[PDB]
UniProtKB/Swiss-Prot annotation, chains A, B:
Record: residues binding IMP: R329, N356, R361, F383, F466, D472
Enzyme Commission number(s): 3.1.3.35, 3.1.3.5, 3.1.3.89, 3.1.3.91
Cysteine pairs bridged by disulfides in the record: C26-C32, C328-C333, C340-C353, C442-C445
Cross-referenced CDD domains: MPP_CD73_N
Annotated residues for binding of AMP: R329, N356, R361, F383, F466, D472
Organism: Homo sapiens (Human)
Glycosylation sites: D28, D286, D308, D369
Topology of the protein relative to the lipid bilayer: Lipid-anchor; GPI-anchor
Protein name: 5'-nucleotidase
Length: 517, 517
């Protein structure tokens, strides 16, 4: 009777300009995808056709490319406003530059509500931040109203830098009272829009009474009903139907990441706000959808300040630097090896390296005459961390390599890329006993060679400060390390190594392997 | 009744200054060995004690260090004359700089006979070279005379550059008539002094009638009776006794190489020149034997011209660069990998490398604050060849890798050191079927990885010109190659790569492996 068209995106990660098929920098414009200008054309095409439409963003617009390194969120605000988003949920990467880095660039400049019900501000901050983000928003859609209630990952204090003032409550505990409040105001059509991952989105649908639809992000999930249009493999059907505890069929959606797909769900409601049915599929923002001229011309104006990073050629590559999550979080990926070889070459003392696959966040292409610029490296290592030195026991590395594949097969970034280590896993074995072989490049030896790792011996390892501090559940490294020394800036390490090598050709050479039985 | 003390050396290879235990450049003088000054002290110590003494050299004084690169044989002559050698046999490395490079520096300036019965000069050369080298020499030792008859490897035309004018006959065919001639002149005490290897030395003793003793070289053989004094493992007892076809016990000797040992054999003869018995052992020229002051002061005068190569620091190494024959001809050695990584880095197109272990002729030490100079690299790659590019079929590389271990276990230089290749051998299998696995770094692929070698596919390989031309029995490469392009000078390739890397740490990382069963 009353149809609503929800449009949505998540984990856009500063991909304001059209990208390549792999979400890295665009070279061949004839086959490029995504970008805010192309997203605007589909959005308007839909707005003309459908009278009741909501554009919503389910978190992580911050951090990803040189755009955010330079504009620090002012670009997210300006272009999201230009596209006319109806609402947005806070994701963990909105806190990467502290609470000040979220407040000044985005919250003050955004012309649309920013939502998160489970973030409670306490102490001195509570007074300034009040009203700049809300737990919900009752938005008028035509003759009707739709309630939108936000949620952010409760893991944000560990994953980002939100500070001691913000308290991140359980998603389901904080959402139910805001939903019950919306229902008491006869707001019967209600959407849960947040950033906690597909598993938490599925629990929110199941447990939170009243929630009619769940838009979400954080897990880069791709759902699709039928034959998909690109290389992304669907995790389930679009929408993913969750039968609630109160027998209600609740649809759950996600639109992959990098602004490559525009999520699209048509929900058909009745008079009492019940969902009769729904259907849709994420729309591939490919070359067939033209970029809007007004937006593309405005992107080109903002691009001028970023071209000082695009000018300097750091080196050259005669191979595809596979810095994708589908390789780096599952197998040995040549980007992981390159970064580990630059890490080891930087300090040289130390021969071993361990790098989390989730820290490698973009590939680099070889087809632009193989050139590598600061802009390419700014997408691979956008966090600006440091490659620190740590002294570790053999049992601590064994425990780390066991953590590296404890929940293998979920696209989790804890999978380790290595240098100076030869590891062999057996996924048939139980979690905590999957490392069958682990040889390491000896230090106390005249001719280095790969000998078995000994539990009672001490080894020096160069790794990101994220891992040294316990990130990605690597609590054993933080607790059991014997020494920790702060290293150089991650981009400056790989940038120096590339200029030293001039031409690079990293390969997948058997540092990580998997056994049959 | 009449005792003769034969003293001898072989494969000295321009080690005029004292060396390290591994025969590379001397750093810690307190534990150094060999050198012409130290060799002179033992030689004179013996000459005082024994009245009937012969110092003889069984070939390969040419090529090995910066001394020969600069002085081109003038140093061999001057210092061999200073030590007062009684005779010398021509080895294949005496022909490395052509016949002119043997004539002018050495043959004309030597004050002792130079011998080789199996080299016959023909055409225009025969007239100039006549008399500058002899097939034999009847030397007066006290009241007696000893005949010395020479022999050079019949493989010299392939191993060196003696030119089309010199003909190299079979050792045994050319020696018998010169021995029979010496016997007709009642020369009953006769020594075979040559350069063909321990196997040919053993056949010369067995087959050539009349030869009482066989001094030799070419195989770097170490013989020793009892507990040896250093890291060299004896191939047999000193002397190695050969029972001849005519029931005569013939002793066979060799004194390792690099002037590290002074070979010493006491032969007790009767009145008719028959060998009653013999005994001895190679003397380790270690720190306990002092270097003669007069000679050391004369070495220091000649060293002044060589110090322009010792000044420039090319790079630095934090690992022992194992460029020894005991590793590089038997297993994967880190010097082989370094050279193959410099070869691949030079041309970069091409990802694979094959380098013969015999072409790596000296290690480099890490204890001199890790510094690497042109003098260090001049000992590893003294031949000044070129690393050429070749297009090869998969079956041609399979045949090459099968040749690499066809006669494994004889310290032959045909063993291949590789880059961009992962090879696994099974020495239990028969010669020609010992390669069980052979993966290669793919070229026609976006992300290089190690995939099985395919017989019908074509691969590009960077290898020394020695191997491209069929050297070390690699006839299949010369015959079956599809393309061959001349590359850069070998020293200039590794010298450039070291300066690019600054600090290097090559390792033994599983490019070559051996299976159990
Ligand atoms: N090196 C390093 N430094 C950090 N500060 C950092 N923060 C997050 N990551 C990685 O990001 C991965 C998750 O990425 P994702 O699944 O695409 C979700 P989200 O990060 O976009 O919210 C984690 O598993 C970490 O490996 C870090 N990696
Ligand atoms: N690269 C390259 N270029 C060449 N021109 C050359 N000539 C000889 N060799 C190597 O030297 C090895 C033999 O060395 P050896 O046993 O110590 C006897 P000898 O060479 O001193 O007479 C061979 O097996 C070859 O690999 C070459 N290697
Ligand atoms: Zn994200
Ligand atoms: Zn996230
Ligand atoms: Zn030799
Ligand atoms: Zn020789």
């Amino acid at each position: 009777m009353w149809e609503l068209t929800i449009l949505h995106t998540n984990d856009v990660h500063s991909r304001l300009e059209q990208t390549s098929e792999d979400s890295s920098k665009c070279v061949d414009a004839s086959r490029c995808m995504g970008g805010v200008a192309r997203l605007f054309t589909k959005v308007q095409q839909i707005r003309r056709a459908e009278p009741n439409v909501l554009l919503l963003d389910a978190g992580d617009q911050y951090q990803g490319t040189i755009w955010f390194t330079v504009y620090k969120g002012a670009e997210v605000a300006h272009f999201m406003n230009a596209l006319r988003y109806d609402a947005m949920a806070l994701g963990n990467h909105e806190f990467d530059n502290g609470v000040e880095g979220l407040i000044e660039p985005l919250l003050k400049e955004a012309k649309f509500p920013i939502l998160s019900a489970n973030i409670k501000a306490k102490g001195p901050l509570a007074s300034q931040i009040s009203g700049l983000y809300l737990p919900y928003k009752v938005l008028p859609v035509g003759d009707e109203v739709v309630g939108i209630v936000g949620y952010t990952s409760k893991e944000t204090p560990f994953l980002s830098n939100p500070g001691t003032n913000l308290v991140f409550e359980d998603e389901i505990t904080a959402l139910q009272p805001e939903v019950d409040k919306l229902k008491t105001l006869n707001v019967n059509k209600i959407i849960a829009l947040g950033h906690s991952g597909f598993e938490m989105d599925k629990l929110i649908a199941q447990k939170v009474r009243g929630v009619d639809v769940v838009v979400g992000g954080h897990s880069n999930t791709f759902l699709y009903t039928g034959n998909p249009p690109s290389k992304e493999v669907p995790a389930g059907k679009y929408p993913f139907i969750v039968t609630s505890d109160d027998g209600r069929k609740v649809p759950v959606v996600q639109a992959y990441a990098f602004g490559k797909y525009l999520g699209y769900l048509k929900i058909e409601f009745d008079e009492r706000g019940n969902v009769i049915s729904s259907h849709g599929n994420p729309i591939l923002l490919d070359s067939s959808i033209p970029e809007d001229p007004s937006i593309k011309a405005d992107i080109n104006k903002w691009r001028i300040k970023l071209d000082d990073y695009s000018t300097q050629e750091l080196g050259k590559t005669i191979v595809y630097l596979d810095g994708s999550s589908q390789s780096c979080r599952f197998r040995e990926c040549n980007m992981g090896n390159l970064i580990c070889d630059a890490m080891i070459n930087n300090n040289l003392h130390v021969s071993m390296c361990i790098l989390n696959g989730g820290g490698i966040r973009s590939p680099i292409d070889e087809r632009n005459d193989g050139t590598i610029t600061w802009e390419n490296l700014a997408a691979v290592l956008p966090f600006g961390g440091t490659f620190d030195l740590v002294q570790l026991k053999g049992s601590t590395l064994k425990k780390a390599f066991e953590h590296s594949v404890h929940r293998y097969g979920q696209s989790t970034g804890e999978f380790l890329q290595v240098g100076g280590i030869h590891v062999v896993y057996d996924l048939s074995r139980k979690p905590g006993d999957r490392v069958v072989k682990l040889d390491v490049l000896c230090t106390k030896c005249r001719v280095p060679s790969y000998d078995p790792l000994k539990m009672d011996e001490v080894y020096k390892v160069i790794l990101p400060n994220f891992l040294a501090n316990g990130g990605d559940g690597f609590q054993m490294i933080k607790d059991e390390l014997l020494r920790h020394d702060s290293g150089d800036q991650d981009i400056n390490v790989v940038s120096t190594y590339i200029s030293k090598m001039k031409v690079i050709y990293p390969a997948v050479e058997g540092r990580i392997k998997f056994s049959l039985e």
